[PDB]
Write a protein that binds this ligand. Structure first.
Ligand SMILES: Nc1ncnc2c1ncn2[C@@H]1O[C@H](COP(=O)(O)OP(=O)(O)O)[C@@H](O)[C@H]1O
Ligand SMILES: [Mg+2]
Length: 246
């Protein structure tokens, strides 16, 4: 049973890409066959895993258009994860997909061609609420929102939840919002805690545990492995994701 996890937040700089790669690595160490999908035309995930996006002969762009089979675009990573990479060509997807029926299902259609090949698919969405993020949410079974807790600035959470609700109404009724993964947690003061409590109070959004601290045997890596183990057990036995605050 392939599990597809979308990692989404229209706010940039909240450690989405780091989260995708780090959860991917932790799951791989636990024996899962992991595919990572880069849906950001800027190619941050792709670059971070050792591939120059500008030099890829093809990418997820051609895969979303149906011009290249998904298997043909996959590349390898040093840690064993498989990558469906991105480059700047993907910025053109919007103009080209808008002209076609079912633009929201392009990634879903692509992953269907790979089903059974991976235990876990993790999708790194760009910092936007356009067709690429919609493709990520439409293809996923679960979604988490990496959520910075350095500052109280969270005015985008409301529109993000509206987007989840719209997807559930129209393109993906089975999408489950697992919750927010706190990122950039600062242990120096109680401020990050207070930020998370304010978010938990104001928004219909579970705040998950543990927080990822601002940074193999590092505290950030330990927190990612702890969160990845929580994901595993949720998918294995239906255990509810532990929460930062009830
Ligand atoms: N735990 C952390 N501690 C310190 N810096 C981090 C941490 N996680 C991510 N960063 C940095 O934050 C910046 C944005 O991270 P990134 O994963 O690219 O976020 P996003 O994908 O949401 O834009 C990057 O420079 C990254 O190196
Ligand atoms: Mg990113």
């Amino acid at each position: 049973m392939t599990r597809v996890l979308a990692v989404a937040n229209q706010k940039g700089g909240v450690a989405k890409t780091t989260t995708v790669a780090s959860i991917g690595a932790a799951l791989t160490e636990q024996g899962r066959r992991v595919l990572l999908v880069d849906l950001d035309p800027q190619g941050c995930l792709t670059f971070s895993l050792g591939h120059d996006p500008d030099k890829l002969p093809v990418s997820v762009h051609e895969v979303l258009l149906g011009d290249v089979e998904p298997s043909a675009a996959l590349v390898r990573t040093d840690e064993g994860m498989t990558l469906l990479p991105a480059n700047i060509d993907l910025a053109g997807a919007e103009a080209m997909l808008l002209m076609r029926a079912g633009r929201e299902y392009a990634l879903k259609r692509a992953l269907a061609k790979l089903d059974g090949d991976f235990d876990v698919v993790i999708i790194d969405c760009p910092p936007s609420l356009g067709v690429l993020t919609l493709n990520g949410l439409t293809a996923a079974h679960d979604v988490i929102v990496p959520l910075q807790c350095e500052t109280l600035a969270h005015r985008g959470v409301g529109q993000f939840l509206r987007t989840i609700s719209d997807v559930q109404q129209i393109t993906n009724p089975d999408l489950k919002l697992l919750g927010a993964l706190p990122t950039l947690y600062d242990s120096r003061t109680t401020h990050s805690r207070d930020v998370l409590l304010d978010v938990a109070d104001r928004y219909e959004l579970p705040v998950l545990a543990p927080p990822i601290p601002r940074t193999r045997k590092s505290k950030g890596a330990i927190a990612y492995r702890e969160f990845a183990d929580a994901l595993l057990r949720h998918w294995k036995s239906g255990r509810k994701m532990p929460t930062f605050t009830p």
